[PDB]
Amino acid sequence: VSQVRQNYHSDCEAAVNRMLNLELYASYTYSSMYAFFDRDDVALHNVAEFFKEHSHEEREHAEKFMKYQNKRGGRVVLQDIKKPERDEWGNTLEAMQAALQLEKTVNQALLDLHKLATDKVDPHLCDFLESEYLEEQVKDIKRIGDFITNLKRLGLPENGMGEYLFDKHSVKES
């Protein structure tokens, strides 16, 4: 084994690799949403830039797992990054609903990894997840939920003026 390895279970090492892949998958889905809202026949540029920023965040999340793996003496093993589930995202409401589900999927994987780390008595991995992932996850889920509530209030999907107003007032001006 690696000269640095201590209290790091093979199962946790493998699960970290799977989590890395999921972060990259999430990044790619957000990239797709960016490209969709940038289309000339969609043209909601603040929404597009919101998703582009989140795509970058998720890739940073992935890189943090790579660094973590090496710090513990595990070995990064990469797999294909699967393309997103859709090629087009409907409108801001449909995209935000998909984002909420994606964030909850990522959250569940993080919680499952915490359970595994707990089972294998790995407090360093528990701390890493709690300090770097779990709270930012709850914050993102809350933000997207708040957005969905406002999109519904604004009459999405039917109310185009509502969708226009959301892009101008609810997401940061880019």
Report the binding-site residues for Fe cation.
Answer: 23, 58, 61, 103, 137, 140
Q: Which does 10 bind (CB under 5 to 8 A by kind): Mg ion, Fe ion, Cl ion, none?
A: Mg ion
State which of positions 10-39 bind Mg ion (CB under 5 A). Answer: 10
120 touching a copy of itself, by CB under 8 A: no
Work out which of 2, 49, 50, 172 binds a copy of itself, going by CB under 8 A: 2
136 touching Mg ion, by CB under 5 A: yes
167 touching Mg ion, by CB under 5 A: no
Backbone angles phi, psi at 122, to 5 degrees: -115, 85
- Residue 25 parent element (H or E): helix 10-37
- According to DSSP, residue 82 is labeled P
Please give the torsion angle defined by the CA atoms of residues 3, 5, 6 and 12, in that order, rounded to the nearest 10 degrees.
Answer: -170
For residues 67 and 128, give the distance between their C-alpha atoms in angstroms, rounded to a whole number.
Answer: 12
Residue pair 69/76 in contact by the 8 Å Cβ criterion? yes
Q: What is the binding site for Cl ion (CB under 5 A)?
A: 5, 7-8, 14, 17, 77, 85-88, 98, 101-102, 105, 111, 135-136, 146-147, 150, 155, 159, 170
